């Protein structure tokens, strides 16, 4: 009766959105880019190999200097590397070894990490003493933490398995905002370049654009068939890419409010664990369960290269802010810097 | 000269590498266990025998270190966070054998997904068929009718390999062994010699549980070594 009529009202709204999206698809991205010159063979080489971790690596993040990077492994260690010289700068032991995400603050003064403990632990790197200690523990999520990203030294957005995202005040330690749209575990999040918006992918096969300062869900993007494991903004902040367990990557435009391109191959039947764009946005790098990373042409849906060094599941990857290199973490406990 | 800053950085490096070597010794010696009992399966009181997203428990047996983890305060959707335990020594799967009126079928479907998961195919499972004292009381009592929830139980007989407890009537032996072969039918259907299921008839207050895990973990590591030499 009442709930069923609300189920019919939602039916007439998704179809109206479907009609409004169908009316904007006057052309396809492949047809707009059919004339451009392809990129050719993008063959990168492993320039560095980082061999400190014991257990599988779950996450990694580049510092804004494009030189220092932090990685998180299930052995209960945060290691900060000097990618240029392969020297380790810090080896932070974790209270909970089941870490699933790690973040590097843009200022470089803090790193964050979290996992099955449901806590986002903030670590001060530049204390006057010299060592690394826990500065803050954020304890509001009722499920494991899947991703976290600093907005600044005082703000950080976290996504959790409790189907919610949250914006934290690091000094007080309380959630300033909570984002409650997803149905399943939120697996990843990506901040816009201006940090005014962020997007997240969840296990409900959907991605949602969130207004940070307002706390609402601007848009919701469908098209994937299974859980979205990774998400990354386009370098201009007007598009983003998602990687799913359906063995596909998909590009979504914010202003078009619909999918623009699908990156898949028939012999690719494993899920995508991580995605990241190049500095120009022409290349879409995706990590896969088959131990490899495939370089895609974001404009032509072509496969232009493969990174096949790792011996186990590629769990994470990231491109430097200057675009000089891309790092890849894996379940083999190794980080490879490719150029 | 800026060459001294490199000497200061490689100084902190070997300072870290010598600390990671001490952590590599503790990590490689401790055997991690995932306790994945169902609700009201007696999993809570097995830990008791001895808000947070996960609980830990340390215990030594013959000076061997064990770190058992119990997932608490996580949603009922496990297909993501259960992948974090792909490299544990064994998953301890606790089942309330007397939970059938269908809790037992749900435990079977969960065991099926764990056994056939892509990332847990090399992880062994120590199966604790818990609540044996409550199971026997239902079989001796009236109109329990195990055959309703499992019709194939009518044409099932106690196997010869069964070692029945002295004193208990064969009606309970037939019941608890039928439940055991329900899980063995799943484990022996897809096991490619990589992982094995170790079933045990346990109660929540059994002091044998800690020794049972120790003996099965020893068999797991022995088979891992026999697998490195291509002997088994």
């Amino acid at each position: 009766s009442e709930l069923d009529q609300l189920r019919q009202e939602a039916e007439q709204l998704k179809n109206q959105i479907r009609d409004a999206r169908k009316a904007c698809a006057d052309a396809t991205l492949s047809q707009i880019t059919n004339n451009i010159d392809p990129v050719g063979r993008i063959q990168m080489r492993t320039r560095r190999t980082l061999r400190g971790h014991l257990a599988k690596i779950y996450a990694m993040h580049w510092g804004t200097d494009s030189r220092l990077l932090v990685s998180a492994s299930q052995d209960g260690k945060l290691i900060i590397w000097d990618s240029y010289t392969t020297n380790k700068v810090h080896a932070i032991p974790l209270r909970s070894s089941w870490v699933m995400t790690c973040a590097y603050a843009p200022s470089g003064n803090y790193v964050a990490c979290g996992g099955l403990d449901n806590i986002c632990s903030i670590y001060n790197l530049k204390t006057r003493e010299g060592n690394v200690r826990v500065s803050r523990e954020l304890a509001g999520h009722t499920g494991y933490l899947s991703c976290c990203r600093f907005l600044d030294d005082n703000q950080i957005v976290t996504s959790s398995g409790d189907t919610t995202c949250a914006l934290w005040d690091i000094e007080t330690g309380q959630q300033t905002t909570t984002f409650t749209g997803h149905t399943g575990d939120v697996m990843s999040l990506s901040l816009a370049p201006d940090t005014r918006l962020f997007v997240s992918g969840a296990c409900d096969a959907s991605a949602k654009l969130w207004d940070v300062r307002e706390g609402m869900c601007r848009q919701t993007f469908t098209g994937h068939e299974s859980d979205i494991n990774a998400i990354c903004f386009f370098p201009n902040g007007n598009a983003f890419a998602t990687g799913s367990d359906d063995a596909t990557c998909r590009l979504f435009d914010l202003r078009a409010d619909q999918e623009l391109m699908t990156y898949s191959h028939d012999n690719i039947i494993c899920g995508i664990t991580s995605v990241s764009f190049s500095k120009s946005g022409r290349l879409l790098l995706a990590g896969y369960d088959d131990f490899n990373c495939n370089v895609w042409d974001a404009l032509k849906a072509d496969r232009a290269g493969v990174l096949a060094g790792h011996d186990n599941r590629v769990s994470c990857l990231g491109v430097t802010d200057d675009g000089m290199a891309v790092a890849t973490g894996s379940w083999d406990s190794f980080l490879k810097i490719w150029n | 000269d800026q060459r001294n800053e490199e000497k200061a950085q490689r100084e902190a490096n070997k300072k870290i590498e010598k600390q990671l070597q001490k952590d590599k010794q503790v990590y490689r010696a401790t055997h991690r266990l995932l306790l994945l009992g169902a609700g009201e399966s007696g999993k809570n009181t097995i830990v008791k025998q001895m808000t947070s997203g996960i609980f830990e428990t340390k215990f030594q047996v013959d000076k061997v270190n064990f770190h058992m983890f119990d997932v608490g305060a996580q949603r009922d959707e496990r297909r993501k966070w259960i992948q974090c335990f792909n490299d544990v020594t064994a998953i301890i799967f606790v089942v309330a054998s007397s939970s059938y009126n269908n809790r037992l079928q749900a435990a079977l479907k969960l065991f099926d997904s764990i056994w056939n998961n892509k990332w847990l195919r090399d992880t062994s499972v120590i199966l604790f068929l818990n609540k044996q004292d409550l199971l026997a009381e239902k079989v001796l009592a009236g109109k329990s009718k195990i055959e309703d929830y499992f019709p194939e139980f009518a044409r099932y007989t106690t196997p010869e390999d069964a070692t029945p407890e002295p004193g208990e009537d064969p009606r309970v032996t037939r019941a608890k062994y039928f439940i055991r072969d329900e899980f063995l039918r799943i484990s022996t259907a897809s096991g490619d010699g990589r992982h094995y299921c170790y079933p045990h008839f346990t109660c929540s207050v059994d002091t044998e549980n800690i020794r049972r895990v120790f003996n099965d973990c020893r068999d797991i590591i022995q088979r891992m070594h026999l697998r490195q030499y291509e002997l088994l």
Partner: nanobody
Amino acid sequence: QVQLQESGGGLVQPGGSLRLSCAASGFTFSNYKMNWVRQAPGKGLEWVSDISQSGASISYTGSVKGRFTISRDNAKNTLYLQMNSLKPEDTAVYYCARCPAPFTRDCFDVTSTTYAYRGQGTQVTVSS
């Protein structure tokens, strides 16, 4: 957009028959294992039957084996459930649940409280 809509269901006499249908859209139907789950009044969700992607492997829960028949038409993107000789204990809302990932042998979370890849269910009442 993954959508599962179950058809059929209603009032049946104790001992009668019925056929449930599941109209699937938004995914490659022939890549996923399909399930039927149900929620009796006051009871939790319980798994009823599953069928593999090819349709050759079929499993049933013990309470319905011999009476219920599951089937799928990969060309029509439909999952069927033929329920013969219904009992009063079969009164429940029957849900069509898709397995979370394609090309997988395992099937997690299909009976969870807030599983995403599941329909809204159709009501089946068996009472004279």
